[PDB]
Design an enzyme around this catalytic site. Structure first.
Site, PDB file in Angstrom:
ATOM      1  N   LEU A 142       0.832  -1.192   0.000  1.00  0.00           N
ATOM      2  CA  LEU A 142       0.000   0.000   0.000  1.00  0.00           C
ATOM      3  C   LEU A 142       0.872   1.250   0.000  1.00  0.00           C
ATOM      4  N   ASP A 143       0.255   2.375  -0.342  1.00  0.00           N
ATOM      5  CA  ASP A 143       0.939   3.661  -0.290  1.00  0.00           C
ATOM      6  C   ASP A 143       0.856   4.252   1.113  1.00  0.00           C
ATOM      7  OD1 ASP A 143       1.737   3.630  -2.961  1.00  0.00           O
ATOM      8  OD2 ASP A 143      -0.116   4.593  -3.642  1.00  0.00           O
ATOM      9  N   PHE A 198       2.673   3.228   9.720  1.00  0.00           N
ATOM     10  CA  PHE A 198       3.245   3.547   8.419  1.00  0.00           C
ATOM     11  C   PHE A 198       4.428   2.628   8.121  1.00  0.00           C
ATOM     12  CE2 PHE A 198       0.860   7.333   7.277  1.00  0.00           C
ATOM     13  CZ  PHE A 198       0.335   7.729   8.491  1.00  0.00           C
ATOM     14  N   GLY A 199       5.197   2.954   7.086  1.00  0.00           N
ATOM     15  CA  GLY A 199       6.252   2.065   6.640  1.00  0.00           C
ATOM     16  C   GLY A 199       5.751   1.065   5.618  1.00  0.00           C
ATOM     17  N   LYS A 200       6.395  -0.098   5.537  1.00  0.00           N
ATOM     18  CA  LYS A 200       6.060  -1.108   4.532  1.00  0.00           C
ATOM     19  C   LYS A 200       4.812  -1.862   4.977  1.00  0.00           C
ATOM     20  CE  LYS A 200       8.132  -2.020   1.401  1.00  0.00           C
ATOM     21  NZ  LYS A 200       8.146  -1.558  -0.015  1.00  0.00           N
ATOM     22  N   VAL A 201       3.648  -1.311   4.639  1.00  0.00           N
ATOM     23  CA  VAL A 201       2.355  -1.878   5.009  1.00  0.00           C
ATOM     24  C   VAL A 201       1.715  -2.492   3.772  1.00  0.00           C
ATOM     25  CG1 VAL A 201       0.062  -1.389   5.933  1.00  0.00           C
ATOM     26  CG2 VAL A 201       2.066  -0.248   6.899  1.00  0.00           C
ATOM     27  N   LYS A 214       2.590  -5.408   8.507  1.00  0.00           N
ATOM     28  CA  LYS A 214       3.640  -4.398   8.568  1.00  0.00           C
ATOM     29  C   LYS A 214       4.993  -5.094   8.598  1.00  0.00           C
ATOM     30  CE  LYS A 214       5.939  -0.825  11.213  1.00  0.00           C
ATOM     31  NZ  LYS A 214       5.913   0.223  10.156  1.00  0.00           N
ATOM     32  N   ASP A 239       0.100   6.102  24.230  1.00  0.00           N
ATOM     33  CA  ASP A 239      -0.131   6.892  23.021  1.00  0.00           C
ATOM     34  C   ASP A 239      -1.557   6.694  22.521  1.00  0.00           C
ATOM     35  OD1 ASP A 239       0.560   8.785  21.151  1.00  0.00           O
ATOM     36  OD2 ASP A 239       1.409   7.339  19.734  1.00  0.00           O
TER      37      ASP A 239
HETATM   38  C1  LIG Z   1       0.088  -5.244  11.352  1.00  0.00           C
HETATM   39  N1  LIG Z   1       0.067  -4.293  12.467  1.00  0.00           N
HETATM   40  C2  LIG Z   1      -0.149  -4.734  13.703  1.00  0.00           C
HETATM   41  O1  LIG Z   1      -0.414  -5.902  13.944  1.00  0.00           O
HETATM   42  C3  LIG Z   1      -0.063  -3.671  14.799  1.00  0.00           C
HETATM   43  N2  LIG Z   1      -0.644  -4.142  16.045  1.00  0.00           N
HETATM   44  C4  LIG Z   1      -1.289  -3.320  16.876  1.00  0.00           C
HETATM   45  O2  LIG Z   1      -1.459  -2.124  16.637  1.00  0.00           O
HETATM   46  C5  LIG Z   1      -1.786  -3.948  18.084  1.00  0.00           C
HETATM   47  N3  LIG Z   1      -1.657  -5.235  18.316  1.00  0.00           N
HETATM   48  N4  LIG Z   1      -2.240  -5.499  19.549  1.00  0.00           N
HETATM   49  C6  LIG Z   1      -2.703  -4.350  20.009  1.00  0.00           C
HETATM   50  C7  LIG Z   1      -3.411  -4.120  21.304  1.00  0.00           C
HETATM   51  C8  LIG Z   1      -2.681  -3.154  22.212  1.00  0.00           C
HETATM   52  C9  LIG Z   1      -3.114  -1.846  22.349  1.00  0.00           C
HETATM   53  C10 LIG Z   1      -2.452  -0.964  23.189  1.00  0.00           C
HETATM   54  C11 LIG Z   1      -1.351  -1.383  23.900  1.00  0.00           C
HETATM   55  C12 LIG Z   1      -0.910  -2.681  23.775  1.00  0.00           C
HETATM   56  C13 LIG Z   1      -1.575  -3.561  22.936  1.00  0.00           C
HETATM   57  N5  LIG Z   1      -2.430  -3.376  19.119  1.00  0.00           N
HETATM   58  C14 LIG Z   1       1.363  -3.170  15.028  1.00  0.00           C
HETATM   59  O3  LIG Z   1       2.025  -2.949  13.770  1.00  0.00           O
HETATM   60  C15 LIG Z   1       1.327  -2.223  12.850  1.00  0.00           C
HETATM   61  C16 LIG Z   1       1.545  -0.877  12.571  1.00  0.00           C
HETATM   62  C17 LIG Z   1       0.758  -0.238  11.636  1.00  0.00           C
HETATM   63  C18 LIG Z   1      -0.251  -0.923  10.960  1.00  0.00           C
HETATM   64  C19 LIG Z   1      -1.088  -0.235  10.035  1.00  0.00           C
HETATM   65  C20 LIG Z   1      -1.778   0.335   9.255  1.00  0.00           C
HETATM   66  C21 LIG Z   1      -2.684   1.081   8.422  1.00  0.00           C
HETATM   67  C22 LIG Z   1      -2.224   2.471   8.101  1.00  0.00           C
HETATM   68  C23 LIG Z   1      -2.209   1.439   7.046  1.00  0.00           C
HETATM   69  C24 LIG Z   1      -0.493  -2.266  11.247  1.00  0.00           C
HETATM   70  C25 LIG Z   1       0.308  -2.913  12.172  1.00  0.00           C
END
Ligand SMILES: CN1C(=O)[C@@H](NC(=O)c2nnc(Cc3ccccc3)[nH]2)COc2ccc(C#CC3CC3)cc21
Ligand SMILES: CN1C(=O)[C@@H](NC(=O)c2nnc(Cc3ccccc3)[nH]2)COc2ccc(C#CC3CC3)cc21
Lengths: 263, 248
Positions: free
Chosen positions: A17-18, A19-22, A36, A124
């Site tokens: 997709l067009d 953060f980082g390598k998502v 990600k 955050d």
């Molecule tokens: C794949 N991905 C993930 O799995 C993320 N996980 C999580 O946010 C999360 N996991 N478990 C929890 C639960 C919790 C909440 C607060 C504190 C502790 C725990 N959050 C972390 O990395 C990513 C970064 C960005 C994106 C995107 C996008 C959209 C913009 C295009 C996706 C991910």
């Protein structure tokens, strides 16, 4: 650890997709997921951290589904939330009604109460970390990886929602009351349909103003937001962290209001 | 309003901006705001309509392959503080003040409150004439959305970021610019509360000759109460005869 181990072969296809390598990917049995990825060119510590996060299991909290470690490329995987984040939805052409905004607030409260109950400080909380699905239910995320110690290090910030005690000291011990402040500003944004502090000119002006007691402009929401919620957000953004309520306390105040007036 | 990169003959980076030589309209300053919509064009057109000799004119915008850039007039001598620290004759300092007044009166007449008036937003051309700029994109709402000196900020905005700025907000900033023009230097939590309580740049630290009328003007314009401050048309009514008879 097998509970969080995923393979590229588990997915039918994926595309950047067009953060980082998502990227967006379709899992063969579990459906659409967001991935990600970071390139590095040790893995067991990463897998345990993923296993720990995967234990956070609650209807209003993002459940880390698994991770992929292949060819020096490291991936986190989660369920796809089609409507994006809360602020994206608030600014949509369709004007989100009061009954829905009230439910979103209650679900944020439920998710944060669960997280604090598990000893997790978010640190955050902000609209970007509140994700919305197709039926307008929400889940609390950590897209900046503030709680992922190891996976954050592999990758090697708005102040509107940050508690005053952390303005200019981001390494102070995190507290549950830090999150309650963030929630207060999210409440305001939910009814304003916008970010706070639009009339600020300089970052230093805003930081000093907030530390001195400046808060989001309540006059922007008085004709939409009920009085009970304005009173709630004022308690939650009190300068004294210990004067802020707990999320279970917030829930016991907000839920009966939602049930009789909003649902 | 819309330009293309092909419209420029040459370009060289200038200490995220570059100086570019246009085929017909000459030298311009170009800043790439974003690399990676109609409202942006409309906002650019409204800035282009702010046409006045003491105000920077937005000359055009470039929107190519996801790259968004603003194009403005080239002001050879940089900003006012750069020039002040270079020595500027009294008659030129008086003319500069009058040109600030003219440009701010024009902007206010068009309903444009600057909100961040300061020497870094006062650009000086090769002949020591000035134009007012908005390099922090304080008025460029839509273009700012593509992506901090408090010395000149009025006390009603210090520790209150929700109060709406007015013409008198800019008049306060103008008073501190006056002090800087004759002091030849920048002025000055503890400072903020001191300023909100009535502290101002020390007039006694101006060492070069400064007319009494200008000392009185800066004191009048940095009154803590915004209603005690004049408008820029009110300032011009008093300052222009002073400049004409004593300074020009
Ligand atoms: C794949 N991905 C993930 O799995 C993320 N996980 C999580 O946010 C999360 N996991 N478990 C929890 C639960 C919790 C909440 C607060 C504190 C502790 C725990 N959050 C972390 O990395 C990513 C970064 C960005 C994106 C995107 C996008 C959209 C913009 C295009 C996706 C991910
Ligand atoms: C190319 N460029 C621009 O066009 C800027 N425009 C303006 O400041 C402006 N345009 N039209 C006006 C007139 C006005 C004045 C007040 C309020 C409303 C309107 N200002 C905005 O972005 C930039 C940021 C920084 C630089 C640089 C540099 C070198 C010198 C150090 C250049 C630009």
């Amino acid at each position: 650890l097998n509970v969080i181990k995923m393979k590229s072969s588990d997915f039918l296809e994926s595309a950047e997709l067009d953060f980082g390598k998502v990227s967006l990917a379709f899992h063969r049995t579990q459906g659409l997921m967001i991935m990600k990825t970071v390139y590095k060119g040790h893995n067991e510590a990463l897998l345990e951290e993923a296993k720990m996060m995967n234990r956070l299991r609650h209807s209003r909290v993002v459940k880390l589904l698994g991770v992929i470690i292949e060819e020096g490329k490291y991936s986190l995987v989660m369920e796809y939330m089609e409507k994006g984040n809360l602020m994206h939805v608030l600014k949509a052409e369709m004007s989100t009604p009061l009954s829905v905004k009230g439910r979103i607030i209650l679900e944020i409260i439920e998710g944060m109460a669960y997280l604090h109950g598990k000893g997790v400080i978010h640190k955050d909380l902000k609209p970007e970390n509140i994700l919305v699905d197709n039926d307008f239910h929400i889940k609390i995320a950590d897209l900046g990886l503030a709680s992922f110690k190891m996976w954050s290090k592999l990758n090697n910030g708005t102040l509107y929602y940050m508690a005053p005690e952390h303005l200019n000291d981001v390494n102070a011990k995190p507290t549950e009351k830090s999150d309650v402040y963030s929630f207060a500003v999210v409440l305001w944004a939910i009814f304003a349909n916008k970010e706070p502090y639009e009339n600020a000119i300089a970052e230093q002006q805003l930081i000093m103003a907030i530390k001195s007691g400046n808060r989001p402009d309540v006059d922007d929401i008085t004709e939409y937001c009920p009085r009970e919620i304005i009173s709630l957000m004022k308690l939650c953004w009190e300068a004294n962290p210990e004067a802020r309520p707990t999320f279970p306390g917030i829930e016991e105040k907000f839920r009966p209001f939602y049930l009789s007036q909003l649902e």
